[PDB]
Membrane-associated protein Vipp1 (Synechocystis sp. PCC 6803), 96 residues
Amino acid sequence: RNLAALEAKISEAKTKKNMLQARAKAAKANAELQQTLGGLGTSSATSA
Amino acid sequence: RNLAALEAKISEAKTKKNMLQARAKAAKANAELQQTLGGLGTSSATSA
C-alpha cells in the first residue's frame, strides 16, 4: 500500500511539475513577446 | 497582431527615412547651386 500510493504520488508530482514548468516557460515566453514589442521602434532613430 | 503592426511600422519607418534622406540630399544639392552661383565671378579677377 505504501508503495502503490508512493508511486502514484511520485508519478503525479513529476508530471505536474513538468507541465507546470512547461506552462510557466510558455507564459514567460508570451510575456517576453509583450516586452520585446515594448522594445518599440519609437526611438533615438528619430533623433538621428 | 504585434508582428503585423511592427512590420508595417518598420516598413514605413524605413521608407519615410529613405525618401526624407533623398529629398533632404536633393534640397541641399539645390541650395548648393544657389551657394555656388553665390560663388560669383564678380571677383579679384577685376583687381588683376
About this structure: Chain B touches chain A at residues 2, 6, 9-10, 13, 17 (CB under 8 Å).
